[PDB]
Amino acid sequence: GINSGTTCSNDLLQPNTEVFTDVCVDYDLYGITGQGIFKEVSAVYYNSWQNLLYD
Amino acid sequence: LNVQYRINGLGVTMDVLNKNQKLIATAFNNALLSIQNGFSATNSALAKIQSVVNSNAQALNSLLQQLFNKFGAISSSLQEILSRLDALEAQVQIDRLINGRLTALNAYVSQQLSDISLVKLGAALAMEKVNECVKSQSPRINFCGNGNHILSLVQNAPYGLLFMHFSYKPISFKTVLVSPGLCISGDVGIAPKQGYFIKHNDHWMFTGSSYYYPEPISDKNVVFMNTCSVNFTKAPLV
Amino acid sequence: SLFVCSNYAACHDLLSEYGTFCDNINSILDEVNGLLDTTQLHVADTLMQGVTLSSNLNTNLHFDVDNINFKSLVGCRSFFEDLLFDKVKLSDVGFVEAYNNCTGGSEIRDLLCVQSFNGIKVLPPILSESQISGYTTAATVAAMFPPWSAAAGIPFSLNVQYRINGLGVTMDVLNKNQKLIATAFNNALLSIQNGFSATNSALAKIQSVVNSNAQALNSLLQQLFNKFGAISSSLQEILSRLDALEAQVQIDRLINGRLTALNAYVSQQLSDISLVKLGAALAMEKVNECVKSQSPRINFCGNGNHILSLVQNAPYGLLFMHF
Amino acid sequence: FNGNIIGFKDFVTNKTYNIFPCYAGRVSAAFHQNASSLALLYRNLKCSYVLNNISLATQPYFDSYLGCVFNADNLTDYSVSSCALRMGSGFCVDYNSYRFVTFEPFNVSFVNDSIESVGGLYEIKIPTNFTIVGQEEFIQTNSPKVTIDC
Amino acid sequence: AYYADSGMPTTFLFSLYLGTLLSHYYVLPLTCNAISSNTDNETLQYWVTPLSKRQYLLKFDDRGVITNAVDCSSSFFSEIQCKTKSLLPNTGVYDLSGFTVKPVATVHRRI
Amino acid sequence: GIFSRVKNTKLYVNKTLYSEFSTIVIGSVFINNSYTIVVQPHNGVLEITACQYTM
Ligand SMILES: CC(=O)N[C@H]1[C@H]([C@H](O)[C@H](O)COC(C)=O)O[C@@](O[C@H](CO)[C@@H](O)[C@@H]2O[C@@](O)(C(=O)O)C[C@H](O)[C@H]2NC(C)=O)(C(=O)O)C[C@@H]1O
Ligand SMILES: *[C@@H]1O[C@H](CO)[C@@H](O[C@@H]2O[C@H](CO)[C@@H](O)[C@H](O)[C@H]2NC(C)=O)[C@H](O)[C@H]1NC(C)=O
Ligand SMILES: *[C@@H]1O[C@H](CO)[C@@H](O)[C@H](O)[C@H]1NC(C)=O
Ligand SMILES: *[C@@H]1O[C@H](CO)[C@@H](O)[C@H](O)[C@H]1NC(C)=O
Ligand SMILES: *[C@@H]1O[C@H](CO)[C@@H](O)[C@H](O)[C@H]1NC(C)=O
Ligand SMILES: *[C@@H]1O[C@H](CO)[C@@H](O)[C@H](O)[C@H]1NC(C)=O
Ligand SMILES: *[C@@H]1O[C@H](CO)[C@@H](O)[C@H](O)[C@H]1NC(C)=O
Ligand SMILES: *[C@@H]1O[C@H](CO)[C@@H](O)[C@H](O)[C@H]1NC(C)=O
């Protein structure tokens, strides 16, 4: 489960931050890394076990 | 007058169409309305421009997945590789990975060189078309329009030029008994520069090469000849 | 799926990660074959024109007018093209036949089918040469018989007479030697069919292009035998005496060497078919400025004072005869 | 010449061999939207040899000059004027099921008239109407100006 | 483990790392009085079909539901259609190379 | 792997509708080791007992 999952290494303590929308930032969403812009939207097709959307 | 003198060169007399200018004007605007409604149907030219835009769109789309191919490398996303391996362990795959990327790039610009060369030749062919049968009319058949091409006009197109053509093609025919070339009692040959010769009502009349019209024989519609061949038709008197 | 790796599933697994690239190569093959078929239909409808011939045609009863022979070039399959088909045996019909001999028996030196067994297949063209030769025969007899659709409604001897009007030659000496100049064309036709026994420039280029095609095929044959830095060249021995993880670098180095060889070959093929398109379009131009109607453009249809021309079907091209 | 194996001998009975390499790979298939079945073509291979390889197909075999065509009745009597599924050498298949009909793109109108100088004159079917028609054509003169950051 | 009582495609339940290769499957006997009731009522209908390595097609709709699946291994229409990224391919003459004879029995290299 | 296809056995006891089907065991050697897998239904709810107990 490379860079994805629940078991997080908290050796370097980083506080959990809210999603700063509409800005070009780097993200660490539960270990998922990258850099991009988040826009607050509405979706209804998501499921209980499903949490990520792919292109 | 331009199109009347132009179809004269295709072998059409002028006496009939002096009364028939109005209906061939309606033929002109009906042909324009038909080709304007011809784009409602998925014809070849729309298929050609859609093929061009889909071809280079698919080329630039195929450029994208060259980043996403596996190659010999363990992945295709270099960001998680550099967040997964150290800098010293990057070069064991990333140097030949970006080498594969650059081979894709120079291959792609080699097909770009090929397509720009062929579209330069297509531009040269369009140049030949527009300076030989758009701004003028050249004696060269089956090059601008198939059959008896009359003239052509060029309209603007996206990433090209649309080439619409006026062509002549009749709908009904008539059988006739004619002879190409003959001679007279003074052993002088009579042969049409264009058209044929019809014999009816005990006289030899002249016809055009594109429409049945018996014209009176003259000296201006004919090319002279010093002596006729033995296998040519012999016409008595004058 | 056959060339860079024949049948080995562990090899095909390492083919499966990079099969998008060879699928793109296959799409490149599909579009160059599409332009090949498109240019073939272009050849078909540019040789075709507004032609009408009389349906009561018999090539064996009525076959000559004013003592000029055409029985070499009269078909429906003419002797004139069949002489050239006797001069070279590597036709596509001969290719199909060579595929038909390679099903068991003799001739262990059979390069055409072991090319097919290694993967490369010379597809036949979508139009048979029989119907193309019949179309050229139909165009020629349209030029020779009423109504002269290919000769603008003018008899053939009258075409010769009206052309020699325009080349600075009077008619006073012409009216007494129609049979003499007819025998002059007959002797010219006999000379140009008899010249094909000697190795001509036309023979030089037709065996040059088919030997260039065969040389490119043989270059693909040795590309399987090239190392590309590996300790061997085929997959069975390196799947046998190695353990497929130390052989994985050998496998991917040989497949990328082979894929670069195919990239060079498809670049060569797209350049080659661009040359075919240009030569084909120039052939269209000279067809409709010589045989359908002569044009006042000097020293392009024939060197010197050109008079008239004829076109015969050829293997992988057209044969153009100019007078 | 190019390192290609040919044959061997046995060390026991001293008899030789010719190793012709075997055949692998299929040929092609044909499909239509309004059809539901498939048209199968197996060129350069014998129908009886194909049936002796694995088993007997549900459709009967049809051997041609090109090869072994399946699920299509060969019909050379009619000619398709315009086809889209080209089998090669002027051959095609189509759905109404799938059948094989020989293809020719063009033909001459074959006007029922004479051939020779009847009384020194000729029978020519000359036009009697005047009719024009526009013609649509496109020539591509420009390409989009792409670029890439290296 | 996957199940879906509702909805004809099945969905994820949980993963279970063991390492031990799983070898055998068996259905228990249920000591019950009469589920058939002298063959006038229902019965048990467990049906089974093995699985292996295959590549399939997963069509998604606008709501992300599996619409259709293509084998690409049984028929010749199983291929071509799925490699052309459609449930129904366009007209064309598409080549096939999905057969190899492999009838051999002896492979050795020796002196 | 295997695929199963189970029609529900809707037996209607009077005013108590049930739908109960059989029990399946999968495993390797089915002993006190090797993580034996037993899943059973109990009247509308499934009971997975996936543990390496005796058989
Ligand atoms: C897989 C199979 O063939 N199942 C049979 C099943 C077995 O043969 C048998 O019951 C198990 O015991 C052995 C090993 O003999 O039997 C079924 O029919 C029974 C016949 O034995 C049936 O008559 C049942 O008989 C009982 O007397 C009993 O307890 O055995 C009473 C029981 O209600 C009755 N079951 C009914 C009518 O459904 C069976 O159990 O259904 C037939 C199966 O196909
Ligand atoms: C006019 O031309 C025709 C057609 O060529 C001649 O008819 C025959 O022509 C062939 C070939 O030239 C000869 O072999 C035949 O002997 C000809 N038949 C006859 C009956 O002559 C025709 O002779 C020509 N007429 C003249 C006066 O030259
Ligand atoms: C792990 O380290 C973090 C500091 O980054 C600390 O807050 C946390 O209590 C530690 N967890 C333990 C000791 O279980
Ligand atoms: C193909 O080759 C074999 C072996 O030489 C020969 O017997 C056969 O006649 C050939 N086929 C044709 C059509 O000539
Ligand atoms: C034939 O084979 C035998 C062994 O089987 C061998 O000893 C002999 O040299 C071979 N050649 C001849 C010509 O007998
Ligand atoms: C197929 O069916 C459609 C729907 O009825 C119809 O419009 C079309 O003409 C048919 N034929 C082809 C070749 O698509
Ligand atoms: C169809 O093919 C068979 C053999 O494949 C042949 O015997 C028959 O003559 C063919 N039908 C024609 C050519 O009409
Ligand atoms: C020629 O064709 C047109 C087409 O509509 C027709 O109206 C006309 O009557 C025909 N005849 C003449 C002599 O124009």
Author numbering:
A (entry chain C): 598 to 652
B (entry chain A): 985 to 1222
C (entry chain B): 819 to 894, 904 to 1150
D (entry chain A): 653 to 748, 765 to 818
E (entry chain A): 211 to 321
F (entry chain A): 101 to 155
Can you list sentences taken from the study reporting this PDB entry?
Coronavirus spike proteins mediate receptor binding and membrane fusion, making them prime targets for neutralizing antibodies. The spike protomer can be divided into an amino- and carboxy-terminal region designated S1 and S2, respectively. Distinct S1 domains mediate receptor binding, whereas S2 comprises the fusion machinery. In HKU1 and OC43, attachment to 9-O-Ac-sialosides occurs through a well-conserved receptor-binding site located in spike protein domain S1A.
Incubation of the HKU1-A spike protein with the receptor analogue 9-O-Ac-Neu5Ac-α2,8-Neu5Ac-Lc-biotin led to marked conformational changes yielding a surprising heterogeneity in structures. We identified and modelled three distinct conformations: a fully closed state (3.8 Å resolution), a partially opened state with a single S1B domain rotated upwards by 101° (1-up, 5 Å resolution) and a fully opened state (3-up, 3.7 Å resolution). In particular, the upper S1A1 subdomain (residues 14–39 and 72–260) rotates inwards by 9° relative to S1A2 and the remainder of the spike monomer. Whereas this motion leaves the S1B–S1B interface unaltered, it has a profound effect on the S1A–S1B contact area, displacing interfacing residues by approximately 8 Å. This reshaping of the S1A–S1B interface seems to be the key phenomenon from which subsequent upward rotation of the first S1B domain follows, involving a 101° rotation and raising the tip of the S1B2 subdomain by 50 Å. Conversion into the ‘1-up’ state eliminates the S1B–S1B interdomain contact. The apparent absence of particles in a ‘2-up’ conformation might be explained by the fact that a lone downward-oriented S1B lacks any such stabilizing interactions with neighbouring S1B domains, probably making this a transient intermediate.
